[PDB]
Amino acid sequence: MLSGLNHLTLAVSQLAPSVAFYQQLLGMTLHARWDSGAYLSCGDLWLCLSLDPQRRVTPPEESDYTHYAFSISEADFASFAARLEAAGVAVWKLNRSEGASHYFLDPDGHKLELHVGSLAQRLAACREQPYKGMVFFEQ
Amino acid sequence: MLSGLNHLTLAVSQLAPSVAFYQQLLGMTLHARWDSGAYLSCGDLWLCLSLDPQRRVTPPEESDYTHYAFSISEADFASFAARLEAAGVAVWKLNRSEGASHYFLDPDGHKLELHVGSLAQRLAACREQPYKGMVFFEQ
Ligand SMILES: C[C@@H]1O[C@@H]1P(=O)(O)O
Ligand SMILES: [K+]
Ligand SMILES: [K+]
Ligand SMILES: [Mn+2]
Ligand SMILES: [Mn+2]
Ligand code: NA
Ligand code: NA
Ligand code: NA
Ligand code: NA
Ligand code: NA
Ligand code: NA
Ligand code: NA
Ligand code: NA
Ligand code: NA
Ligand code: NA
């Protein structure tokens, strides 16, 4: 039986710039680095950066909606997003769903998000205003 | 400051087959589905499947190393992987690192993994046998 997310691994085209992005701009903890990768952590999240010379720098209009959202408190959200903006980090979408979200890109075009709010909060908002054709499942 | 992964969103080409994969073959909890998505949970992990016309069914040799790993116990690992293989779920990589891992594909070719072990256990094993060029960082 599966108990949660064990780790997220992102293919990166240049290791040093990607480590700098996740460690310095996003504040994650760098634990180890080798010739072809790095290990970082973000709370309980284990992030592996894997050097892959065939990772394409991908424009967001050419990639699908697959994306990775990190948790942040409502008190920290606005200034964190403002620093990413000041650092020239590109935004790939405007927030259109409940709970503050900032949708931004990593150096290789991986689609990322800062989000304030839980699954329980999202389901509660959906129960008041269901999405199109939505069906609810219980205990 | 980021506190962990908030949610993982996967673009899918056919919603019902993808829900069946994550709910029935991987055992995750289905909370809600709608015309263009579904919300599931796996322990603390909030998984969103997003119906996206841009998603193509992608052979593993046409995608990079980016992949998503779920936690499983030592005791459950072998039979869980065997059930996936018996369900026709393809394997995309042989395990070559510390701790049991099974590398498998979802219906659209998203690269997935079952893994037994934590970041702390990986770091300890890496100190004993360092990867090429591996360096570690204190605290
Ligand atoms: C929560 C799932 O990623 C979608 P959203 O970011 O559009 O809300
Ligand atoms: K949102
Ligand atoms: K492994
Ligand atoms: Mn999202
Ligand atoms: Mn992995
Ligand atoms: Na971790
Ligand atoms: Na993608
Ligand atoms: Na950018
Ligand atoms: Na960048
Ligand atoms: Na989390
Ligand atoms: Na589960
Ligand atoms: Na959408
Ligand atoms: Na690869
Ligand atoms: Na993939
Ligand atoms: Na993917």
Author numbering:
A (entry chain B), B (entry chain A): 1 to 139
Task: Pull text from the paper.
FosA enzymes are manganese (Mn+2)- and potassium (K+)-dependent glutathione transferases that conjugate GSH to carbon 1 (C1) of Fos, leading to the opening of the epoxide ring of Fos. Members of the VOC family share a common fold composed of two βαβββ units that form an incompletely closed β-sheet barrel.
The crystal structure of the dimeric FosAKP was determined via X-ray crystallography at 1.48 Å resolution. The three-dimensional structure of FosAKP is folded into a dimer, providing an active site per monomer. Both subunits are composed of two tandem βαβββ motifs that follow a 3D-domain swapping during homodimer formation. Consequently, each active site was formed by residues originating from both subunits. A Fos molecule was found bound in the actives site of the first molecule of the dimer. In the active site of the second molecule, a tartrate molecule was bound, which originated from the crystallization buffer. Important residues that play crucial role in Fos binding include Ser97, Lys93, His67, Tyr65, Arg122, Glu113, and Tyr103. However, two additional residues (Tyr131 from molecule A and Tyr39 from molecule B of the dimer) appeared to contribute significantly to Tar binding. In particular, the C-terminal part of the Tar-bound subunit appears to be less solvent accessible, suggesting the formation of a more compact complex.
